[PDB]
Amino acid sequence: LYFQGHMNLDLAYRSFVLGVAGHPQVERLIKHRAKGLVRRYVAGETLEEALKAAEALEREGVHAILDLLGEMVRTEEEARAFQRGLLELVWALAGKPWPKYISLKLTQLGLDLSEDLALALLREVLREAEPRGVFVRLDMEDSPRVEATLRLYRALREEGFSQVGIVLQSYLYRTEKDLLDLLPYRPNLRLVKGAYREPKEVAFPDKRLIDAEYLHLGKLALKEGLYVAFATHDPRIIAELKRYTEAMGIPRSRFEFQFLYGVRPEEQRRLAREGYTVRAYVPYGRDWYPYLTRRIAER
Amino acid sequence: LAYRSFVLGVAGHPQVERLIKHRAKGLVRRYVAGETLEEALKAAEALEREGVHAILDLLGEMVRTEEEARAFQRGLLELVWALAGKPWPKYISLKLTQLGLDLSEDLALALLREVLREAEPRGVFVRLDMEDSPRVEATLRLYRALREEGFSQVGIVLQSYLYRTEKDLLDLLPYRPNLRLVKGAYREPKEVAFPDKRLIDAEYLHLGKLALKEGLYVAFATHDPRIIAELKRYTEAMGIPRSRFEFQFLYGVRPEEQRRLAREGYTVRAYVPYGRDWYPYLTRRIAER
Ligand SMILES: *N1=C2C(=O)[N]C(=O)N=C2N([C][C]([O])[C]([O])[C]([O])[C]OP([O])(=O)OP([O])(=O)O[C][C]2O[C](N3[C]=NC4=C3N=[C]N=C4[N])[C]([O])[C]2[O])C2=[C]C([C])=C([C])[C]=C21
Ligand SMILES: *N1=C2C(=O)[N]C(=O)N=C2N([C][C]([O])[C]([O])[C]([O])[C]OP([O])(=O)OP([O])(=O)O[C][C]2O[C](N3[C]=NC4=C3N=[C]N=C4[N])[C]([O])[C]2[O])C2=[C]C([C])=C([C])[C]=C21
């Protein structure tokens, strides 16, 4: 496609990586010749490999968020099969001596098929998770899914669940109002910049404004007394949040930093040694190749 | 950067000053109203005809003695007395060092109290401009003291580049301060102020939105189009009425934008200097852009 008289470069780049990755040969060679590279970013194909990765993180003083990967869920049957995978994860984490935290996307529980289905399946996950001390994060997907995601969060909180948190994205205009609307829930928040392609009508097109909004929302949340997980790799933002929290006397027990597994691992450890709570987000599952393709196909 | 050096360098020469005063009156009058109060009032009338309001700023040589402080205060009193009965919004700005702050806090407070006593009954609003970081604490002490004495038509300026500003803002909330928010104009070390323009801008937006959400009246004193556009978007999206905030610009800086925002129904003011000592102010205007 074209944008403003010139080829859409974002589109061109995405389409090339997707075409190249989809070629049977390059996939064959990535699986065979690039095993070490892949395992820096994805634990493995199995729950067993994920747990070993979490143990290896914990030995270095960094906590784990376990993220089950799966093919895009398109039928009720697939949503139930994915929930099954989530339940095995919850049951497997149950004994572990370290903090237990899983992440999931509501579309994988059939949100697009039925909001009622997603809620039913999610509630069954929380029923297992909460007595086991397993925290469940509802990852935030693209803008058309925000209202439903917030609805399901409020529903579960109102049914008595507390071991559940949400993600807010600093690139959306609507996020400050969402945050303010949610305050009576005293939500546990993960703050991210935002990973989806959104039109200028719903999201700041300017990286300076996305970054400014991230800092504004983080500081607002901190001053409101909310527990906030700063999910960012941006050194400017990390340095400012460290300075701000120290200046404001905000205890280390009231916030944390989160990084993708294998991204700035040296900084993950440094922040850990400085006394901050740090987690790495650890994907695992049979669908790692399409997943890594999409991460590459982004920026 | 090379343009700045050249300008500041050439500006100090007496033959250059003679040329500007005789041959570049149109340039001078873009940025300063003139040497006299009479000229400042005429400049304010001209702005008002375009729907833009005026902030009147008396310029004088740096105050170094009590006598000089009292002389400056007299200039401010004449301004206040002259603004009385003008039909349009009356707003003056002052720097506390010009009222002898560095000589004595007691002196600056006494001189300022007298100005506020003459100003309030005449409907003249008085802004305490914020100077460098070593003066912030005294400025806020004087502000709080006068608020507690019952003065209400006095406001303060906070600068987004200082680490201390958010705490200052939160500390001042019980006073319900009328605020002008600026980026900050002084050379401050990395220990006290964000070195990175991206962070100064981010803090400006953060403080502005905090202040609006707390229900404070805020004057956004900035010429930055990215910030102005974001503040317009935010206030609209949040349903903040145009009666609860304003934009302020230096006189002669983006005058078309001033008129445009006025036509869009925003409160807009231009900061208009006048007085004998206008020549160093003018040079900083030329050098800046
Ligand atoms: N899960 C979510 C989610 O639920 N919703 C969502 O929209 N996004 C999710 N994210 C992804 C984030 O939104 C975001 O895309 C990433 O975190 C990346 O943004 P970041 O790191 O804040 O800032 P940036 O891209 O502007 O990068 C600025 C600087 O950071 C450093 N950087 C970034 N990426 C790097 C890197 N350095 C080395 N390698 C890599 N790959 C650079 O210096 C760069 O200049 C999401 C994120 C996270 C962390 C979690 C736990 C969960 C979700
Ligand atoms: N009085 C105060 C005060 O009491 N204390 C104080 O420290 N500073 C005062 N200011 C000055 C401001 O702090 C500040 O220096 C100026 O307002 C300039 O900052 P601004 O305009 O927010 O942002 P910038 O310089 O980074 O510029 C960014 C963009 O803005 C546009 N711009 C800026 N300057 C321009 C210009 N466009 C044309 N011409 C000029 N000269 C550009 O697009 C640029 O990319 C102070 C300011 C004001 C307004 C008042 C009323 C009172 C005080």
Side-chain angles (χ1 to χ4, degrees), chain B residues 30-31 55 91 93-95 127-132 157-159 161 180-186 197 201 204 220-227 248-250 252-254 269-271 284-285:
Chain B
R30 176 172 185 184
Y31 297 109
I55 301 164
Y91 181 155
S93 243
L94 86 244
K95 281 164 227 288
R127 183 81 62 194
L128 309 184
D129 292 345
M130 194 62 91
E131 303 180 75
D132 60 340
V157 174
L158 295 170
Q159 304 144 318
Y161 69 178
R180 175 197 294 158
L181 187 64
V182 302
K183 285 190 193 183
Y186 296 89
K197 268 193 189 209
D201 291 0
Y204 191 98
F220 296 118
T222 178
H223 317 274
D224 185 329
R226 179 193 281 105
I227 290 179
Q248 306 183 160
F249 295 76
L250 300 180
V253 176
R254 308 194 60 206
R269 310 198 197 268
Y271 187 94
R284 268 64 107 188
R285 236 74 283 149

Short mmCIF file of all heavy atoms in Angstrom, two decimals, chain B residues 30-31 55 91 93-95 127-132 157-159 161 180-186 197 201 204 220-227 248-250 252-254 269-271 284-285 288-289, ligand 2, unseen atoms left out:
data_model
loop_
_atom_site.label_atom_id
_atom_site.label_comp_id
_atom_site.label_asym_id
_atom_site.label_seq_id
_atom_site.Cartn_x
_atom_site.Cartn_y
_atom_site.Cartn_z
N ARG B 30 7.81 44.80 17.69
CA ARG B 30 7.21 43.47 17.59
C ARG B 30 7.26 42.76 18.95
O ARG B 30 6.32 42.02 19.32
CB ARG B 30 7.90 42.62 16.52
CG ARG B 30 7.34 41.19 16.47
CD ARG B 30 7.84 40.35 15.31
NE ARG B 30 7.14 39.06 15.33
CZ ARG B 30 7.37 38.05 14.50
NH1 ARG B 30 8.30 38.15 13.55
NH2 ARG B 30 6.67 36.93 14.63
N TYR B 31 8.33 43.00 19.70
CA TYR B 31 8.62 42.22 20.92
C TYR B 31 8.48 42.99 22.23
O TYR B 31 8.38 42.38 23.29
CB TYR B 31 10.02 41.61 20.83
CG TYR B 31 10.14 40.63 19.69
CD1 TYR B 31 10.90 40.92 18.56
CD2 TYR B 31 9.46 39.41 19.73
CE1 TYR B 31 10.99 40.03 17.50
CE2 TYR B 31 9.55 38.50 18.68
CZ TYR B 31 10.31 38.81 17.57
OH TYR B 31 10.38 37.91 16.54
N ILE B 55 -0.63 40.61 29.37
CA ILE B 55 0.05 40.58 30.66
C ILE B 55 1.11 41.68 30.60
O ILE B 55 2.01 41.64 29.75
CB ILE B 55 0.73 39.23 30.88
CG1 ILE B 55 -0.29 38.08 30.82
CG2 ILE B 55 1.57 39.22 32.18
CD1 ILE B 55 0.39 36.72 30.63
N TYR B 91 -3.78 42.28 34.22
CA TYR B 91 -2.86 41.24 34.68
C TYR B 91 -1.43 41.80 34.56
O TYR B 91 -1.01 42.25 33.49
CB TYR B 91 -3.10 40.01 33.79
CG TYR B 91 -2.32 38.72 33.99
CD1 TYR B 91 -2.90 37.51 33.57
CD2 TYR B 91 -1.02 38.68 34.51
CE1 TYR B 91 -2.22 36.31 33.66
CE2 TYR B 91 -0.32 37.44 34.62
CZ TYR B 91 -0.94 36.28 34.18
OH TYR B 91 -0.32 35.09 34.24
N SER B 93 2.84 41.08 35.73
CA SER B 93 3.83 40.07 36.15
C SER B 93 5.02 40.76 36.78
O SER B 93 5.41 41.86 36.33
CB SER B 93 4.30 39.25 34.96
OG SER B 93 3.95 37.88 35.07
N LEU B 94 5.59 40.15 37.82
CA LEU B 94 6.79 40.68 38.43
C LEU B 94 7.76 39.60 38.90
O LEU B 94 7.35 38.47 39.15
CB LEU B 94 6.44 41.67 39.57
CG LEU B 94 6.11 41.47 41.08
CD1 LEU B 94 4.66 41.86 41.52
CD2 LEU B 94 6.65 40.23 41.82
N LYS B 95 9.04 39.96 38.99
CA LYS B 95 10.08 39.09 39.54
C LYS B 95 10.44 39.59 40.92
O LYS B 95 10.74 40.79 41.10
CB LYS B 95 11.29 39.02 38.61
CG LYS B 95 11.01 38.06 37.45
CD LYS B 95 11.96 38.19 36.27
CE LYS B 95 11.19 38.24 34.93
NZ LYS B 95 10.65 36.91 34.63
N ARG B 127 0.95 38.21 38.89
CA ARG B 127 1.69 36.94 38.80
C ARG B 127 3.11 37.10 39.35
O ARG B 127 3.86 38.00 38.95
CB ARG B 127 1.78 36.45 37.34
CG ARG B 127 2.49 35.07 37.17
CD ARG B 127 1.56 33.89 37.45
NE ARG B 127 0.42 33.86 36.51
CZ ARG B 127 -0.66 33.11 36.70
NH1 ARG B 127 -0.74 32.32 37.77
NH2 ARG B 127 -1.68 33.16 35.84
N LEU B 128 3.48 36.19 40.25
CA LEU B 128 4.87 36.09 40.72
C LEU B 128 5.65 35.19 39.77
O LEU B 128 5.47 33.97 39.79
CB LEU B 128 4.91 35.54 42.16
CG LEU B 128 3.99 36.23 43.18
CD1 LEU B 128 4.18 35.67 44.61
CD2 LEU B 128 4.21 37.74 43.19
N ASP B 129 6.48 35.78 38.92
CA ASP B 129 7.23 35.00 37.95
C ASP B 129 8.22 34.12 38.73
O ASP B 129 8.65 34.48 39.82
CB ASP B 129 7.94 35.89 36.94
CG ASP B 129 6.97 36.64 36.00
OD1 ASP B 129 5.77 36.28 35.91
OD2 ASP B 129 7.44 37.61 35.36
N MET B 130 8.56 32.95 38.21
CA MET B 130 9.50 32.10 38.95
C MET B 130 10.91 32.28 38.41
O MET B 130 11.14 32.17 37.20
CB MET B 130 9.07 30.62 38.89
CG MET B 130 9.81 29.76 39.92
SD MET B 130 9.53 30.18 41.68
CE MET B 130 8.14 29.12 42.05
N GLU B 131 11.85 32.59 39.31
CA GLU B 131 13.24 32.75 38.92
C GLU B 131 14.03 31.43 39.04
O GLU B 131 13.44 30.34 38.85
CB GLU B 131 13.86 33.93 39.68
CG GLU B 131 13.01 35.18 39.37
CD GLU B 131 13.49 36.43 40.04
OE1 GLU B 131 14.51 36.98 39.59
OE2 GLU B 131 12.81 36.86 40.99
N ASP B 132 15.33 31.50 39.28
CA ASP B 132 16.14 30.26 39.29
C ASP B 132 15.93 29.39 40.54
O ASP B 132 15.23 29.81 41.48
CB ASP B 132 17.63 30.53 38.98
CG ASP B 132 18.28 31.47 39.97
OD1 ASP B 132 17.58 32.21 40.66
OD2 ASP B 132 19.52 31.44 40.05
N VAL B 157 4.12 30.70 39.25
CA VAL B 157 4.59 30.05 38.02
C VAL B 157 5.33 28.82 38.48
O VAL B 157 6.15 28.91 39.39
CB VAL B 157 5.59 30.96 37.25
CG1 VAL B 157 6.20 30.24 36.03
CG2 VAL B 157 4.91 32.29 36.85
N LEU B 158 5.06 27.70 37.85
CA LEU B 158 5.88 26.53 38.08
C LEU B 158 6.54 26.09 36.79
O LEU B 158 5.96 26.23 35.71
CB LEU B 158 5.08 25.40 38.73
CG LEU B 158 4.53 25.64 40.17
CD1 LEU B 158 3.57 24.52 40.51
CD2 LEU B 158 5.61 25.76 41.21
N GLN B 159 7.77 25.58 36.91
CA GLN B 159 8.61 25.21 35.77
C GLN B 159 8.75 23.71 35.65
O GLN B 159 9.20 23.04 36.60
CB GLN B 159 10.00 25.83 35.91
CG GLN B 159 10.03 27.37 36.09
CD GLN B 159 11.13 27.83 37.02
OE1 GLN B 159 11.37 27.22 38.06
NE2 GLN B 159 11.82 28.91 36.64
N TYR B 161 10.80 21.86 34.05
CA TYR B 161 12.13 21.23 34.02
C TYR B 161 12.73 20.83 35.39
O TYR B 161 13.69 20.09 35.42
CB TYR B 161 13.14 22.03 33.18
CG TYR B 161 13.60 23.39 33.71
CD1 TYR B 161 14.55 24.11 32.99
CD2 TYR B 161 13.06 23.98 34.88
CE1 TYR B 161 14.97 25.38 33.40
CE2 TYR B 161 13.51 25.27 35.32
CZ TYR B 161 14.47 25.95 34.54
OH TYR B 161 14.95 27.20 34.90
N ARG B 180 0.60 29.46 36.41
CA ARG B 180 1.14 29.49 35.05
C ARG B 180 2.21 28.40 34.96
O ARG B 180 3.11 28.35 35.79
CB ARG B 180 1.80 30.83 34.74
CG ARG B 180 2.49 30.87 33.38
CD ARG B 180 3.47 32.05 33.28
NE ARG B 180 2.76 33.34 33.32
CZ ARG B 180 3.31 34.50 33.67
NH1 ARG B 180 4.58 34.53 34.06
NH2 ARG B 180 2.58 35.62 33.69
N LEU B 181 2.09 27.53 33.96
CA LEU B 181 3.04 26.45 33.77
C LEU B 181 3.95 26.82 32.61
O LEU B 181 3.47 27.13 31.53
CB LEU B 181 2.29 25.15 33.47
CG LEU B 181 3.14 23.89 33.40
CD1 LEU B 181 3.80 23.55 34.75
CD2 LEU B 181 2.25 22.72 32.90
N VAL B 182 5.25 26.79 32.86
CA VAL B 182 6.28 27.06 31.83
C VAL B 182 7.26 25.90 31.78
O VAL B 182 7.29 25.09 32.70
CB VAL B 182 7.07 28.35 32.11
CG1 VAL B 182 6.14 29.57 32.21
CG2 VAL B 182 7.92 28.25 33.40
N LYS B 183 8.07 25.82 30.72
CA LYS B 183 9.09 24.78 30.66
C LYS B 183 10.24 25.12 31.61
O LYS B 183 10.74 24.23 32.30
CB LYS B 183 9.60 24.58 29.23
CG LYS B 183 8.61 23.82 28.34
CD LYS B 183 9.27 23.42 27.03
CE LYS B 183 8.21 22.97 26.02
NZ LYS B 183 8.85 22.51 24.74
N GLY B 184 10.62 26.40 31.67
CA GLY B 184 11.74 26.87 32.52
C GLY B 184 12.82 27.49 31.65
O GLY B 184 13.16 26.95 30.59
N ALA B 185 13.33 28.65 32.07
CA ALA B 185 14.20 29.45 31.22
C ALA B 185 15.67 29.52 31.66
O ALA B 185 16.49 30.10 30.94
CB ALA B 185 13.63 30.87 31.11
N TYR B 186 16.00 28.96 32.82
CA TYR B 186 17.33 29.16 33.38
C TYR B 186 18.24 27.97 33.12
O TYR B 186 17.77 26.91 32.75
CB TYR B 186 17.25 29.45 34.88
CG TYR B 186 16.53 30.73 35.17
CD1 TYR B 186 15.15 30.74 35.35
CD2 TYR B 186 17.23 31.94 35.25
CE1 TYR B 186 14.48 31.92 35.61
CE2 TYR B 186 16.56 33.15 35.50
CZ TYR B 186 15.19 33.12 35.68
OH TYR B 186 14.50 34.28 35.95
N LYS B 197 15.37 17.38 26.78
CA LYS B 197 14.17 18.10 26.34
C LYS B 197 12.92 17.23 26.26
O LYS B 197 11.82 17.70 26.52
CB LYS B 197 14.40 18.75 24.97
CG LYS B 197 14.91 20.18 25.04
CD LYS B 197 14.80 20.86 23.67
CE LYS B 197 15.51 22.22 23.67
NZ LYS B 197 14.89 23.17 22.70
N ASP B 201 9.49 18.23 28.25
CA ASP B 201 8.20 18.24 27.55
C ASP B 201 7.21 17.26 28.18
O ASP B 201 6.05 17.61 28.39
CB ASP B 201 8.40 17.87 26.08
CG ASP B 201 9.15 18.96 25.30
OD1 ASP B 201 9.51 19.99 25.89
OD2 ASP B 201 9.39 18.76 24.08
N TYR B 204 5.98 18.67 31.40
CA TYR B 204 5.08 19.78 31.16
C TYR B 204 3.65 19.22 31.00
O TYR B 204 2.72 19.66 31.68
CB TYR B 204 5.50 20.57 29.90
CG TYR B 204 4.76 21.88 29.74
CD1 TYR B 204 5.33 23.08 30.16
CD2 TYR B 204 3.45 21.90 29.24
CE1 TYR B 204 4.61 24.29 30.04
CE2 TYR B 204 2.75 23.10 29.11
CZ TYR B 204 3.33 24.28 29.52
OH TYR B 204 2.64 25.49 29.40
N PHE B 220 -1.24 27.82 30.39
CA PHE B 220 -0.20 27.12 29.66
C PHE B 220 0.64 28.11 28.87
O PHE B 220 0.25 28.54 27.76
CB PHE B 220 -0.85 26.05 28.76
CG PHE B 220 -1.56 24.97 29.53
CD1 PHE B 220 -2.92 24.78 29.38
CD2 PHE B 220 -0.85 24.16 30.42
CE1 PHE B 220 -3.56 23.77 30.11
CE2 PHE B 220 -1.50 23.17 31.16
CZ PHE B 220 -2.85 22.98 30.99
N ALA B 221 1.76 28.51 29.47
CA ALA B 221 2.69 29.47 28.89
C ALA B 221 3.76 28.74 28.09
O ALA B 221 4.84 28.38 28.62
CB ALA B 221 3.30 30.37 29.97
N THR B 222 3.46 28.51 26.82
CA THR B 222 4.33 27.74 25.94
C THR B 222 4.02 28.13 24.51
O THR B 222 2.90 28.54 24.20
CB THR B 222 4.16 26.21 26.16
OG1 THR B 222 5.00 25.51 25.24
CG2 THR B 222 2.71 25.75 25.97
N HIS B 223 5.01 28.04 23.63
CA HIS B 223 4.77 28.28 22.21
C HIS B 223 4.85 26.97 21.42
O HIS B 223 4.80 26.99 20.19
CB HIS B 223 5.80 29.27 21.63
CG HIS B 223 6.07 30.45 22.52
ND1 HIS B 223 5.30 31.60 22.50
CD2 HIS B 223 7.04 30.66 23.44
CE1 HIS B 223 5.78 32.46 23.39
NE2 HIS B 223 6.83 31.91 23.98
N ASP B 224 4.98 25.85 22.14
CA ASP B 224 5.27 24.55 21.56
C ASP B 224 4.01 23.97 20.91
O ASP B 224 3.03 23.67 21.62
CB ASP B 224 5.81 23.62 22.67
CG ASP B 224 6.27 22.26 22.15
OD1 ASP B 224 5.72 21.76 21.15
OD2 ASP B 224 7.22 21.67 22.74
N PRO B 225 4.01 23.82 19.56
CA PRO B 225 2.77 23.38 18.91
C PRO B 225 2.34 21.96 19.26
O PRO B 225 1.15 21.66 19.22
CB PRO B 225 3.09 23.51 17.41
CG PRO B 225 4.56 23.42 17.33
CD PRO B 225 5.09 24.04 18.59
N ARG B 226 3.30 21.10 19.61
CA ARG B 226 2.98 19.71 19.93
C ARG B 226 2.22 19.67 21.26
O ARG B 226 1.22 18.95 21.40
CB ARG B 226 4.24 18.86 20.01
CG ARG B 226 3.97 17.41 20.38
CD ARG B 226 5.24 16.67 20.75
NE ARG B 226 6.00 16.26 19.58
CZ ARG B 226 7.13 16.85 19.18
NH1 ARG B 226 7.65 17.87 19.86
NH2 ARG B 226 7.74 16.39 18.10
N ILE B 227 2.71 20.43 22.22
CA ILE B 227 2.09 20.56 23.54
C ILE B 227 0.72 21.24 23.45
O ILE B 227 -0.25 20.74 24.01
CB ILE B 227 3.03 21.31 24.51
CG1 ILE B 227 4.22 20.38 24.83
CG2 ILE B 227 2.27 21.74 25.80
CD1 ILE B 227 5.26 20.99 25.78
N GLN B 248 -0.74 31.20 27.04
CA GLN B 248 0.02 32.47 27.08
C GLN B 248 1.24 32.35 26.20
O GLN B 248 1.87 31.29 26.16
CB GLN B 248 0.44 32.84 28.51
CG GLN B 248 -0.74 32.88 29.52
CD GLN B 248 -0.29 33.31 30.92
OE1 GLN B 248 -1.11 33.75 31.73
NE2 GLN B 248 1.00 33.23 31.18
N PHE B 249 1.57 33.44 25.51
CA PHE B 249 2.67 33.52 24.55
C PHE B 249 3.42 34.80 24.87
O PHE B 249 2.83 35.75 25.37
CB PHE B 249 2.14 33.68 23.11
CG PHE B 249 1.35 32.50 22.61
CD1 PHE B 249 0.04 32.27 23.04
CD2 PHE B 249 1.91 31.63 21.67
CE1 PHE B 249 -0.69 31.16 22.58
CE2 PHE B 249 1.18 30.53 21.21
CZ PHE B 249 -0.10 30.29 21.68
N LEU B 250 4.71 34.84 24.54
CA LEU B 250 5.42 36.13 24.56
C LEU B 250 4.86 37.02 23.45
O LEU B 250 4.51 36.53 22.38
CB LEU B 250 6.92 35.91 24.36
CG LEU B 250 7.58 35.03 25.45
CD1 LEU B 250 9.08 34.88 25.16
CD2 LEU B 250 7.37 35.62 26.85
N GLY B 252 4.61 39.10 20.31
CA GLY B 252 5.28 39.00 19.01
C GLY B 252 5.75 37.61 18.60
O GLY B 252 6.32 37.45 17.51
N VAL B 253 5.53 36.62 19.47
CA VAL B 253 5.95 35.24 19.20
C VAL B 253 4.71 34.42 18.84
O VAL B 253 3.79 34.28 19.66
CB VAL B 253 6.72 34.62 20.40
CG1 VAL B 253 7.07 33.13 20.15
CG2 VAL B 253 7.99 35.43 20.68
N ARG B 254 4.72 33.88 17.62
CA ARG B 254 3.56 33.20 17.01
C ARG B 254 2.26 34.03 17.13
O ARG B 254 1.25 33.53 17.65
CB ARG B 254 3.39 31.80 17.63
CG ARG B 254 4.66 30.94 17.61
CD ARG B 254 4.35 29.45 17.92
NE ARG B 254 3.42 28.89 16.92
CZ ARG B 254 2.60 27.86 17.14
NH1 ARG B 254 2.58 27.26 18.33
NH2 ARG B 254 1.80 27.44 16.17
N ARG B 269 -3.44 35.08 26.19
CA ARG B 269 -2.77 36.32 26.61
C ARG B 269 -1.39 36.38 25.98
O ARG B 269 -0.75 35.35 25.77
CB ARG B 269 -2.61 36.41 28.14
CG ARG B 269 -3.88 36.14 28.93
CD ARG B 269 -3.85 36.65 30.40
NE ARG B 269 -4.95 35.96 31.07
CZ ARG B 269 -6.20 36.41 31.21
NH1 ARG B 269 -6.54 37.64 30.83
NH2 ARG B 269 -7.11 35.63 31.77
N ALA B 270 -0.96 37.60 25.71
CA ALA B 270 0.42 37.87 25.32
C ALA B 270 1.14 38.61 26.44
O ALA B 270 0.61 39.55 27.02
CB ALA B 270 0.45 38.72 24.03
N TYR B 271 2.38 38.18 26.70
CA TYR B 271 3.22 38.73 27.75
C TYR B 271 4.02 39.91 27.18
O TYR B 271 4.96 39.72 26.39
CB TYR B 271 4.14 37.60 28.24
CG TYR B 271 5.00 37.90 29.45
CD1 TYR B 271 4.55 37.56 30.75
CD2 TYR B 271 6.27 38.43 29.31
CE1 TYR B 271 5.34 37.81 31.87
CE2 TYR B 271 7.08 38.67 30.43
CZ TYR B 271 6.60 38.35 31.70
OH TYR B 271 7.40 38.58 32.81
N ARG B 284 17.64 38.48 23.46
CA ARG B 284 17.29 37.10 23.75
C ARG B 284 16.14 36.62 22.87
O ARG B 284 16.07 35.44 22.55
CB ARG B 284 16.97 36.94 25.24
CG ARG B 284 18.18 36.53 26.09
CD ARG B 284 19.29 37.59 26.10
NE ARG B 284 19.37 38.29 27.38
CZ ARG B 284 20.14 39.35 27.62
NH1 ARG B 284 20.90 39.86 26.65
NH2 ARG B 284 20.16 39.90 28.83
N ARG B 285 15.26 37.54 22.47
CA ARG B 285 14.15 37.22 21.56
C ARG B 285 14.68 36.88 20.16
O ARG B 285 14.28 35.87 19.56
CB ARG B 285 13.16 38.39 21.49
CG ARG B 285 11.72 38.03 21.83
CD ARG B 285 11.53 37.80 23.32
NE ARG B 285 12.05 36.50 23.75
CZ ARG B 285 12.55 36.24 24.95
NH1 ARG B 285 12.62 37.20 25.86
NH2 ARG B 285 12.99 35.02 25.24
N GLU B 288 17.06 33.56 20.27
CA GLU B 288 16.37 32.30 20.58
C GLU B 288 15.97 31.47 19.36
O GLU B 288 16.17 30.25 19.35
CB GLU B 288 15.14 32.57 21.45
N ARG B 289 15.41 32.11 18.34
CA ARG B 289 14.95 31.41 17.13
C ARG B 289 15.68 31.89 15.87
O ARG B 289 15.47 33.01 15.40
CB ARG B 289 13.43 31.56 16.98
N1 LIG C 2 8.00 33.62 32.43
C1 LIG C 2 8.68 32.53 32.94
C2 LIG C 2 9.01 32.33 34.39
O1 LIG C 2 8.37 32.97 35.28
N2 LIG C 2 9.99 31.47 34.71
C3 LIG C 2 10.66 30.79 33.75
O2 LIG C 2 11.56 30.01 34.02
N3 LIG C 2 10.38 30.91 32.45
C4 LIG C 2 9.42 31.75 32.03
N4 LIG C 2 9.02 31.74 30.69
C5 LIG C 2 9.92 31.18 29.66
C6 LIG C 2 9.61 29.69 29.45
O3 LIG C 2 10.15 28.91 30.53
C7 LIG C 2 10.22 29.16 28.15
O4 LIG C 2 11.63 29.45 28.14
C8 LIG C 2 9.54 29.70 26.87
O5 LIG C 2 8.11 29.65 26.97
C9 LIG C 2 9.94 28.85 25.67
O6 LIG C 2 9.55 27.49 25.89
P1 LIG C 2 8.36 26.85 24.99
O7 LIG C 2 7.92 27.88 24.00
O8 LIG C 2 7.33 26.15 25.81
O9 LIG C 2 9.07 25.61 24.22
P2 LIG C 2 10.46 25.57 23.41
O10 LIG C 2 11.32 26.79 23.62
O11 LIG C 2 11.05 24.20 23.66
O12 LIG C 2 9.98 25.57 21.88
C10 LIG C 2 9.41 24.37 21.34
C11 LIG C 2 8.66 24.78 20.09
O13 LIG C 2 7.91 25.97 20.35
C12 LIG C 2 7.99 26.87 19.23
N5 LIG C 2 8.73 28.10 19.58
C13 LIG C 2 9.42 28.32 20.71
N6 LIG C 2 9.98 29.55 20.67
C14 LIG C 2 9.63 30.11 19.50
C15 LIG C 2 8.84 29.20 18.81
N7 LIG C 2 8.35 29.53 17.57
C16 LIG C 2 8.64 30.73 17.03
N8 LIG C 2 9.41 31.62 17.69
C17 LIG C 2 9.91 31.34 18.91
N9 LIG C 2 10.68 32.23 19.59
C18 LIG C 2 8.80 26.14 18.17
O14 LIG C 2 7.90 25.48 17.28
C19 LIG C 2 9.61 25.13 18.96
O15 LIG C 2 9.97 23.96 18.23
C20 LIG C 2 7.86 32.49 30.34
C21 LIG C 2 7.17 32.19 29.15
C22 LIG C 2 5.92 32.74 28.87
C23 LIG C 2 5.28 32.35 27.55
C24 LIG C 2 5.33 33.59 29.80
C25 LIG C 2 3.97 34.21 29.56
C26 LIG C 2 6.01 33.89 31.01
C27 LIG C 2 7.28 33.34 31.29
#
